[PDB]
Design a protein around this ligand. Structure first.
Ligand SMILES: Nc1ncnc2c1ncn2[C@@H]1O[C@H](CSCC[C@H](N)C(=O)O)[C@@H](O)[C@H]1O
Ligand SMILES: Nc1ncnc2c1ncn2[C@@H]1O[C@H](CSCC[C@H](N)C(=O)O)[C@@H](O)[C@H]1O
Lengths: 259, 259
């Protein structure tokens, strides 16, 4: 069958690419974490299709469900907010296929591609989407106009010491920093820690911003400084952006020099 | 008037977001580097609109042209391949507005926003788009599934020593690396140099790939290794991706572990 990993962008109907719309239109079943599925349902894009959201809390379960359905011949659309390849479903799906020993049967490289196994075969494709970094950047100004690093503060499957390594490196390289999964009830110290690490490489007054629910209901853009992040409150719907040693504010906009 | 920086994605019609389509539909005049403008013209999206491509070779000229037209009351669409905020027109435009001393007149933060000056006023908005990183990643597998750094190898407005600093940092932090503007007739040594720097942090057999004209005519996906990049030939239509110490190839796909 087919397994299309559909990146839906920041969350609003106009935010999806036509390629994403078409992938959803041609899908028989749609799988994804509850929040994404509901957004699509609200848009009226899931009408007359099988929708799986129950028991789809875990990433591994979503991937296994989508893969097994695809292998059984179904036309599946597995949705990820933003882009599937950025802290999304692309990795879990490929790692699962790898674990099951599915082999490529079309001689191609990269994706899309046809893979097969004793269970059956699957045509896998990834539909790219506007990732959080660019989506929030468009609501800020030109914060990512130069070299940038994308870092997730989720230490669920990644040891914190490795994340600190990533942060120190971003600091020394003078990279604009975009923090994905900046904070949660459990993970309430990671953001502050990240700010303290970067503060060893750039000024306290360095531009920073917290953009919540970009392109969605209750969207919020909060401008602050790197020092301000030490006490800032972020959520799972927030993306944080930290400027480099050249970033500055310009009439309400977050400007990172192109040169 | 209006100045909409429209990110058109990788280059194919289905690759644009609906928001981008709508911004183009509502524009009276469209400005952009020749190649992007031609792609849109081919798509049939510039019919009945004023199209400026002549003399639009330089980024500064494109920005000034778009800004002055907007200030004169025109509804302008300035196009950038991928996303305007990633080595695109967002920075040049804001820096120019800053230089002219345009002031914000709506009390808002970030963008969109209304700015004004003795010359007139302009409503500025950035329409995000799928940037090269995610677009090529979708044609590779899950290469960016973990922390990633975006680096441009264009040393036109950025001293090479700073780029080397960025590269060494990406290496030590064990970041997946995406190289924008990897090579040109003039800049034919930067890619090799970049590979040699990263080779000090990760194995020669580390997965790497060169993706040319993603989603366009003559699209090409070439898989290789970090060592292979030392002699690889890239162009201005190519994006290079270098895996981290955990990246591996899986049945033709470029897989970077999510955890
Ligand atoms: N609309 C939105 N506004 C702000 N941040 C968002 C967002 N959508 C996703 N994110 C960011 O991404 C995190 C989830 S991780 C999944 C990210 C997704 N694949 C992408 O490409 O964006 C969130 O915790 C947040 O930091
Ligand atoms: N269709 C495509 N395929 C491969 N690389 C592309 C591409 N479009 C843009 N790029 C990459 O981007 C460079 C131009 S820099 C402008 C990038 C653009 N704003 C974006 O967001 O992608 C190219 O030299 C190349 O490295």
């Amino acid at each position: 069958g087919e397994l299309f990993l559909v990146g839906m962008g920041p969350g609003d109907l106009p935010g999806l690419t036509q390629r994403a719309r078409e992938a959803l239109e041609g899908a028989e079943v749609v799988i994804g974490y509850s929040t994404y599925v509901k957004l699509l349902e609200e848009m009226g894009l899931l009408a007359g299709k099988e929708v799986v959201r129950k028991g789809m809390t875990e990433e591994l379960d979503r991937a296994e469900e989508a893969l097994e359905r695809a292998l059984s011949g179904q036309r599946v659309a597995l949705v990820s907010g933003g882009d599937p390849g950025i802290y999304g479903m692309a990795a879990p799906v490929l790692e699962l296929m790898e674990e099951r020993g599915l082999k490529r049967v079309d001689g191609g490289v990269g994706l899309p591609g046809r893979f097969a196994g004793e269970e059956g075969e699957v045509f896998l494709a990834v539909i790219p989407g506007v990732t959080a970094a660019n989506a929030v950047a468009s609501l800020l100004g030109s914060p990512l106009a130069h070299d940038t690093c994308l870092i997730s503060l989720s230490d669920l499957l990644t040891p914190w010491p490795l994340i600190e390594r990533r942060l120190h490196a971003a600091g020394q390289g003078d990279f604009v920093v975009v923090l994905y999964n900046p904070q949660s009830k459990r993970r309430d110290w990671q953001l502050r820690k990240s700010a303290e690490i970067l503060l060893e490489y750039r000024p306290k007054e360095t531009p920073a911003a917290l953009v919540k629910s970009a392109y969605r209901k209750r969207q919020e853009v909060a401008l602050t400084t790197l020092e301000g992040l030490r006490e800032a409150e972020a959520g799972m719907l927030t993306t944080v952006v930290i400027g480099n040693r050249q970033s500055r504010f310009y009439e309400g906009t977050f400007l990172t020099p192109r040169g």
